[PDB]
């Protein structure tokens, strides 16, 4: 299968297929940026985490902009446009404007800045938030992509049939284990830092194929699109990262957190209504959230421990009245196999939960070759000039300019 | 590569692909059957009009069976669905209401009624007419596939090979024949002759690189949907053939060959105004019809040859004042490389032309091997009681009970 390809790859082998081979979360919250905020600009920077051995030497630089240039020829195909305004996606219909779509069918991946430093690559996309937001995770992917097809590139056909076969070995373990848990509810996240294109799509359909109604969907919209799966996702910290740094008072930096949420409901209802508040930490969100913020469907407790952070968003919807077994609660991140199902039987029955299976899905070949890790990132670095910001749960954490962090730290404090 | 394939085709292997693998007219029918004429029923019977050659010797019974079966197997895709409802097609958006694809979104060919005698085949589908309307196409296809496949059981890869290389040199050169007419407009339309689907598949393609801008769509939905082409149709025969076997009084039936054209441009209306005259003969349709007929866009000689019955209709818009120049001819009477050469030169500028290409371009394999085509159709046999007729425009070729046939005829006249 998938093997064999990797081998007989003469023309340009390109990573990105589509436009739309991107996380569902990054259209809507396209579509909200293109709505609410068409004038706001904001930077996008690629940044290897593992300084530990350089980048710029696995990765050909010219391969680079081969890569990015053909992405930069995309277009939303006749079926992709029919496609995203047809479907139903939350349970409803027509999320995305006729007028949105009609600006989309036209839109194209704009200029991008790269240059090599420290065997290491500088990757910024420059502009107005609705040109730059979509670049994020076709940028991972084709870094990803090429970190590991560069790898397998000495390997021989054989080398290949028993590197893929133990993976997959791998991979259908983890389903035989989630198959015991039959209430579970999972879902593919692993677009950004998947081990390839090809692969994903053999692990989305393993999953599918294992787990059953367990299987809620992927958030690759081009993988749902082709299966007729559930399109996955909500929104990230992108949102309150930049209306953040757009705050000019105290009065607006505090109310940032909450106002994302006003933004999103004037576009979306229903079970798209899920609170990701983390970003400047949860307590300090949790102790200024207006009464309102308990009627949302449910909480994405993201950068915390699963069931610390979990049962922290419980106790405070005890305090507000209401019924934890009526809202939902989404454990995203890096959680491998061992932290779903003890997070899964230690809130069972207690409160609806839903999982996103990322990397420990798409991208695990650790012992599967007869190879690295790499912790990269493209996130938003600033937003009309000014440095935008990220303090989770753990603010030693932290994400962007210091001197920033350490205002947004001061200003919205820190848990004990 | 159709050859590989054949040969290398255990479990069924399905002809028919989807419930839009057929014509667009018979989903654009199938609506207003469904929107004017719930209640009526109608049945359908498969007629081998060819003595000579026994399809029972050729197809075995069972595994037309199994193929039948199969198809009533078949349900709208998720995607079909989407893609019905928001594709344009002539012109117009949601050409299909919401009420009807909900509809077809549950419909299942119904049963069949399959006998064998004196070495033919005998099928025939009873019910509600929109409940029988969609086999006509998917039934046609089982048998010529299957008539494909009995004949290449006993070829072998080279054999094959070499067969399906010199078809594809045949075609290529008609291709090379037609590039010399840059304004001649022709569309795929040899769903229900086709040699096979990928055949087919094939064909359309080729005429698609061959010709250009002068190939304007086809008439099969799926492979219309799959290349973003247009797909191409109006309205066929069973519709008058319908309304004139469930009419009564003697004016009711005088009343039926245009009661359709009032009913059908109730749903539709634009280029899909294309008048379906031979059903009980031209000459007698033009000496009545109302006066506006004369505004519909244009005409479709089914019957009479080319030329003839091209002068024939024109020489009547003329009398009625009406630019010729402005109206469109449609000549899709399975005609040849020469016959559209022929047809096209003969009334260039004259009016506005546009040719069906069936049979001789998705079935000719004439002297490809290193079989005999027959002559198989499906029409309405009877309408909630009443036999169907079809006194076409040549009474050597009508259909349907002989007596009824002549009772039409005394009604309607006779041209020659």
């Not at 081979?21 to 709505?35: A, N, P, R, S, V």
């Amino acid at each position: 299968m998938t093997k064999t390809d990797i081998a007989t790859r003469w023309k340009l082998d390109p990573i990105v297929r589509s436009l739309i081979d991107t996380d569902f979360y990054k259209l809507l919250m396209l579509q909200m940026i293109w709505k609410l905020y068409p004038e706001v600009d904001a930077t996008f920077s690629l940044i290897n985490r593992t300084k530990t051995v350089r980048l710029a030497e696995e990765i050909d630089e010219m391969e680079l902009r081969e890569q990015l240039d053909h992405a930069r020829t995309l277009r939303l195909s006749k079926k992709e446009n029919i496609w995203l305004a047809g479907n139903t996606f939350y349970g409803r219909s027509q999320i995305f404007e006729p007028e949105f779509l009609s600006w989309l069918s036209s839109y194209q991946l704009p200029e991008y800045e790269l240059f090599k430093r420290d065997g290491q690559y500088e990757l910024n996309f420059h502009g107005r938030w609705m040109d730059t937001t979509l670049w994020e995770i076709p940028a991972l992917s084709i870094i990803n992509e090429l970190r590991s097809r560069s790898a397998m590139r000495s390997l021989g056909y054989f080398t290949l049939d028993v590197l893929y076969a133990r993976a997959k070995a791998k991979m259908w373990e983890k389903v035989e284990r989630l198959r015991e848990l039959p209430g579970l509810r999972i879902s593919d996240f692993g677009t950004r830092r998947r081990h390839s294109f090809l692969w994903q799509r053999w692990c989305v359909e393993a999953l599918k194929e294992g787990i059953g109604p367990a299987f809620t969907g992927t958030s690759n919209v081009l993988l749902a699109m082709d299966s007729d799966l559930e399109a996955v996702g909500t929104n990230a910290h992108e949102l309150p990262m930049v209306v953040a740094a757009l705050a000019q008072t105290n009065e607006e930096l505090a109310a940032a957190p909450y106002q994302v949420l006003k933004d999103w409901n004037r576009l979306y209802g229903g079970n798209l209504l899920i609170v990701l508040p983390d970003a400047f930490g949860t307590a300090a969100f949790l102790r200024n959230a207006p009464e309102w913020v308990a009627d949302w469907t449910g909480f994405r407790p993201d950068s915390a421990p699963p069931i610390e952070g979990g049962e922290k968003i419980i106790e405070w919807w005890r305090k507000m009245g209401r019924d934890p077994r009526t809202k939902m609660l989404i454990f995203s991140d890096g959680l491998d196999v061992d932290a779903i199902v003890d997070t899964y039987r230690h809130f069972e029955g207690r409160v609806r939960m839903s999982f996103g299976w990322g990397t420990n899905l798409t991208n695990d070949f650790a012992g599967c070759a007869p190879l690295k890790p790499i912790s990269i990132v493209c996130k938003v670095s600033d937003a009309n000039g000014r440095p935008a910001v990220k303090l989770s749960d753990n603010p030693q954490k932290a994400t962007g300019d210091p001197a920033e962090v350490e205002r947004y730290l001061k200003f919205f404090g820190e848990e004990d």
